[PDB]
Ligand binder design. Structure first.
Ligand SMILES: Cc1cc(=O)oc2c(CN(C)C)c(O)ccc12
Ligand code: NI
Length: 341
């Protein structure tokens, strides 16, 4: 059954609540983004209204075959009335099509649901600048000060420079990038752009990228693997055995693989600056773990919440243990006492 932190009180609305059957009293189901833990349960057999971004709607239609009559895309940064309640969708700076949702309740209460987000100072000049938020439903994925990582820009600079050096030294090297979901497309797009190549991938992954409204996409991606020296593979194949196997299939075009595994945070972020990152190597294969995050760092999250000054915070991640819950509650109180709200 549907948990309390996925319900929006005083409305008929739920958020990211498709795996619980028919939810009692739910007249409209919101979907913040197309990641599997959030869409779990949606299919061609779903017959209630779904509200989401245009990009999320494209993915629902083409990947999950949800019927067009039930998909309700909304524009960003625009006041919309849904079942008698004013709502706004805001860019979440997560994966393509990901949104935060502002709900203006009939009783005067204002709720922000962040979905999954990477907090940024640019959000301080969205439609949030105006007004008071009474309740914040917060992506607390990395809510502890040990969680540090670089900017996305710094990580992409490292990846571009690393790939360009390797292929200029050896014109017969292949670059491989791992993926298991939408998000983090800049990693493979930036590498292909510096190398003058299209990105080669499966038919299934090509279909997914065609749903994302990325400008000039037809110029950047392909299903013709032989025409490309940047290949995308499933994340599970980014290991010495899987990469050895892939190199065999390329028909003696290549004699080296440089591979990237975009992760989130790992314990090596504790002690290794992005510039000092080194790969795991076996023979003619090297693998780089790069900390490309689409979730807020601790510091980014703290700045956002101290700016917004919500009256109450409801975490939506790390909710399952008493230790996690107590830790998060202690940080929220510190933030409030430091800033004075
Ligand atoms: C064939 C080959 C395999 C490999 O793993 O690395 C290479 C490098 C990179 N450093 C120097 C080892 C080259 O510069 C040139 C060729 C290769
Ligand atoms: Ni997500």
């Amino acid at each position: 059954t549907c948990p309390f932190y996925k319900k929006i009180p005083g409305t008929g609305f739920t958020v990211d609540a498709f795996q619980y059957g028919v939810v009692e009293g739910c007249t409209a189901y919101f979907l913040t983004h197309f990641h599997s833990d959030h869409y779990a349960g949606l299919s061609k057999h779903f017959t209630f209204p779904v509200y989401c971004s245009e990009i999320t709607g494209n993915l629902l239609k083409n990947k999950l075959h949800v019927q067009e009559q039930y998909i309700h895309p909304l524009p960003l940064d625009t006041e919309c009335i849904v079942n008698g309640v004013k709502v706004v969708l805001l860019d979440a700076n997560h994966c393509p099509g990901a949104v935060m949702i502002l709900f203006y309740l009939p009783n005067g209460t204002v709720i922000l649901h962040t979905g999954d987000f990477r907090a940024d100072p640019s959000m301080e000049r969205s439609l949030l600048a105006d007004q008071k938020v009474h309740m914040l439903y917060l992506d607390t994925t990395y809510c502890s000060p040990e969680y540090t990582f670089p900017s996305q820009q710094e990580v992409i600079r490292f990846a571009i420079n690393t790939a360009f050096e390797a292929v200029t030294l050896n014109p017969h090297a292949l670059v491989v990038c791992g993926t298991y979901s939408i998000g983090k497309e800049k990693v493979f797009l930036a590498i292909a752009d510096v190398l003058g190549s299209k990105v080669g991938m499966s038919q299934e992954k090509y279909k997914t990228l065609q749903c994302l409204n990325i400008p000039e996409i037809n110029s950047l991606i392909t299903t013709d693997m032989c025409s490309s020296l940047v290949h995308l593979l499933p994340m599970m194949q980014i290991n010495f055995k899987g990469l050895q196997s892939h190199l065999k299939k390329c028909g003696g075009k290549y004699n080296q693989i440089l591979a990237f595994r975009p992760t989130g945070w790992t314990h090596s972020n504790k002690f290794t600056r992005i510039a000092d990152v080194i790969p795991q190597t076996k023979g003619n294969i090297s693998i780089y773990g790069i900390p490309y995050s689409e979730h807020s760092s601790y510091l980014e999250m703290k700045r956002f919440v101290q700016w917004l000054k919500p009256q109450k915070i409801i975490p939506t991640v790390n909710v399952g243990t008493w230790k996690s819950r107590s830790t998060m509650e202690k940080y929220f109180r510190e933030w409030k006492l430091e800033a004075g709200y």
